[PDB]
Design a protein around this nucleic acid. Structure first.
Ligand SMILES: Nc1nc2c(ncn2[C@@H]2O[C@H](COP(=O)(O)OP(=O)(O)OP(=O)(O)O)[C@@H](O)[C@H]2O)c(=O)[nH]1
Ligand SMILES: [Mg+2]
Lengths: 48, 327, 81, 49, 146
RNA sequence: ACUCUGGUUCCUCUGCAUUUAACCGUGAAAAUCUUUCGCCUUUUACUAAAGAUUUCCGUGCAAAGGAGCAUACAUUGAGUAAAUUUUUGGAGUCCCCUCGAAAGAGCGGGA
């Protein structure tokens, strides 16, 4: 879900057509395990 | 750590992120706790080394879920004595006179044990007893931190102080006299109260389709766990099976479950409660020959003894090292 | 929403900041713009009113009707939105 | 997560995610999808109450 | 493919163990048998054993259950994927969207129904939607034969 | 109002496809070197693992040129088309006191 907010606020943010980007799973073990292991913050400006 | 997958990540970071050295890893275990399942039959006294003061204590099983309330800070020993006393008399229906007389939680300010002052003020004056109060609390917290069976923390014991001869003058009631002696009194009350071990239990939620339910019980049965609810997931084909399993028997539970179901089952596990290890840990009729997994009545004897071997303690509790014989 | 001109959009982003506005009768109100509207009705919290003689008062809330506002001073950072 | 949030005195709010799984995997008729969504909201409010 | 996937075969090869039905390789480290050290850290008298740490668990959690993993190229497998629940339709005559009887009914016996704060009273029942407003795909059929 | 271009399909050249968790390749070869295992009276051809490099069958995109087919000017980068309370169809004008040569200005006052 955060991948969508990233994609909306970052024009160059790439989501694969067939795999989740998981921008906030920044650790390589989170990339490999496929689950979020540690919390990652993301500050963005967004319009209501 | 909290579970298998937690340690796998903690150790991964130890290997690949932080330490970059070879580490031996032991087989996983759990910390046990110690409890008494019965009311202390004798009342147990401990004379201070100077042979002047005479502490007396008893031990009891602590009533259901009061330890969860203490540990979750639903009640706090730092509250004002009316508010503190109000909690015990309102929620647990305690006598108001008892509720005034709590002296500590232990082994820390949120620990699952209570010390009470059951000393009636005719037998010793409340002021003199108040002079040694802080030493008695500190030896009780020492006792409950180590505990007499296998030096694992005591839990869910209600210790009542109920008598105290105390010397008239400070040099005969010093902290170094009282603090070791309250430990010996707590330990003698403990070992009279029918001691037992406690192990932590997970609560397991399994989501699996209908045909995998018989596998779930089969994998639980090998690990002493049991199913407490088996309900369909609404608007789904899967079912939800809820179960308690010992943490000590949960290592590889998730892996066993997924393999015997081809990953059609998956499960997740959280700590839920402390429950007695079965059997009597002090039963010397049981010998722990290490050839095989012990049958379930011997577990308390095994877990105690091997925890003593691990910690570098003597093989067996010399229970009479604390008691007086005509106690 | 449906499109509306940039000045009104910027006014909605001026919400929550301090603003100053002068009314057609000349009084200057400084306050925190708690609400704006597409007709630029304004609710100011925490308001200070300044009369043309230079006296002043605090006012806890003010609603000013949109077609009675002469101009506003928005905050500076809104030039980046 | 809901209970721990209330204990920590956080404002609990709800997103019912992965709603495509009703359409595409479960294939519930739209009427039965509404009941599935409603029950999730009911389950959550059962916790809050 | 839990424990029968590419990463679990890599971990098995690295640990010099074999999955039942997996491939078997020449030992990557030739002398991992040297755990016959008789040191007290491994002492069978001190360890409590409940279910034996069989090699599936060594592969499933490579780092909690193994030594030397800085020199061994052990690999994490993907932990879990939320199980897909698509049931194949048997009958072409069924609607594309139908409540399959393998899906459990949407009920729970003891939930309170949530309070629906619907608009009420005489002025509010008269609220009408304009005559052109219409669902966003009203004339499209919900499903086709495709 | 300015300059900017015909669609398609194919050929060929050039450049780029390293911050790899992972993937130019949802497939999968061969060699060399170094090392360690097994064959063995030697070498070749080998066993089967590691590490480092190569070759080979392939891949993507951009850009340029050409070659065939049937044929269309728009359109990209730069930039077009509401008199009834909250803005764009008038609550507008005029007249005294004050400072000041001079013309404005007061929540000034009056029709
Ligand atoms: N059908 C469907 N699947 C989704 C959707 N969003 C995510 N998923 C899938 O669900 C899985 C989990 O997605 P994640 O984004 O990793 O969810 P997550 O909660 O952050 O996982 P953790 O943080 O580790 O608990 C992946 O396999 C996703 O492909 C969705 O919107 N619809
Ligand atoms: Mg020769």
């Amino acid at each position: 879900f955060l991948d969508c907010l990233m994609e909306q606020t970052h024009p160059e943010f790439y989501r694969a057509e067939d795999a989740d980007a998981r921008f906030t799973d920044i650790l390589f073990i989170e990339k490999q395990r496929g689950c979020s292991i540690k919390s990652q913050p993301v500050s963005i400006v967004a319009q209501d | 750590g909290t579970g298998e997958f937690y340690m796998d990540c903690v150790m991964h970071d130890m290997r690949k992120v932080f330490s970059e050295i070879d580490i031996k890893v032991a087989d996983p275990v759990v910390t046990f706790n110690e409890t008494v399942i019965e009311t202390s039959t004798l009342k147990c006294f401990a004379e201070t080394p100077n042979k002047k003061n005479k502490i007396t204590m008893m031990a009891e099983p602590l009533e259901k879920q009061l330890d969860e309330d203490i540990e979750n800070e639903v009640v706090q020993i730092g509250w004002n004595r009316r508010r503190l006393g109000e909690f015990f008399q309102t929620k647990y229906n305690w006598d108001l006179l008892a509720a005034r007389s709590i002296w500590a939680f232990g082994p820390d300010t949120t620990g699952p044990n209570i010390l009470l002052d059951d000393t009636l003020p005719s037998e010793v004056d409340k002021h003199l007893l108040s002079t040694v109060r802080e030493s008695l609390v500190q030896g009780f917290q020492w006792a409950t931190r180590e505990g007499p069976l296998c030096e694992e923390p005591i839990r869910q014991v209600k210790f009542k102080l109920l008598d105290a001869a105390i010397a008239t003058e400070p040099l005969y009631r010093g902290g170094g006299q009282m603090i070791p002696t309250a430990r010996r009194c707590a330990y003698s009350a403990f070992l009279m109260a029918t001691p037992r071990l406690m192990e932590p239990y997970y609560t397991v939620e399994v989501v699996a389709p209908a045909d995998c339910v018989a596998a779930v019980y089969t994998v639980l049965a090998k690990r002493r766990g049991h199913v407490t609810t088996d309900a369909p997931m609404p608007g789904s084909p899967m079912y939800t099976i809820s179960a308690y399993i010992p943490v000590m028997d949960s290592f590889g539970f998730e892996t066993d479950l997924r393999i015997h179901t081809q990953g059609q089952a998956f499960c997740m596990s959280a700590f839920h409660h402390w429950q007695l290890v079965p059997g009597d840990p002090l039963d010397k009729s049981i010998v722990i020959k290490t050839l095989d997994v012990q049958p379930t009545p011997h577990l308390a004897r095994e877990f105690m003894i091997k925890t003593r071997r691990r910690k570098g303690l003597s093989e067996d509790v010399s229970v009479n090292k604390f008691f007086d014989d005509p106690m | 929403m449906t499109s509306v001109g940039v000045p009104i959009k910027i006014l909605h982003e001026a919400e929550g900041h301090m603003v100053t506005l002068e009314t057609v009768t000349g009084e200057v109100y400084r306050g925190k713009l708690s609400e704006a509207e597409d007709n630029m009705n304004c609710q100011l919290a925490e308001t200070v009113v300044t009369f043309r003689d230079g006296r002043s008062h605090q006012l806890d809330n003010v609603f000013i009707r949109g077609n009675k506002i002469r101009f506003m001073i928005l905050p500076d950072m809104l030039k980046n939105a | 997560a809901i209970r721990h949030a209330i204990q920590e005195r956080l404002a609990v709010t709800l997103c019912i995610s992965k709603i495509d799984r009703l359409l595409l995997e479960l294939k519930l008729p739209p009427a039965d999808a509404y009941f599935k969504l409603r029950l999730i909201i009911d389950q959550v409010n059962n916790i809050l109450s | 493919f839990y424990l029968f996937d590419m990463k679990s075969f890599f971990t098995a090869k690295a640990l010099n163990v074999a999955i039942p039905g997996g491939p078997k390789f020449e030992p990557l480290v030739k002398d991992l048998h040297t755990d016959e050290d008789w040191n007290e850290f491994n002492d069978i008298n001190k360890v409590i054993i409940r279910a034996p740490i069989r090699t599936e668990y060594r592969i499933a959690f490579p780092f909690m259950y193994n030594n030397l993993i800085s020199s061994l190229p052990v690999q994490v497998s993907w932990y879990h994927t939320p199980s897909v629940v698509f049931i194949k339709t048997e009958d072409p005559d069924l609607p594309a969207f139908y409540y399959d009887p393998l899906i459990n009914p949407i009920v729970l016996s003891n939930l309170k129904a949530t309070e629906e704060n619907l608009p009420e009273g005489e002025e509010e029942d008269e609220w009408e939607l304009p005559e052109d407003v219409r669902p966003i795909f009203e004339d499209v059929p919900l499903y086709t034969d495709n």
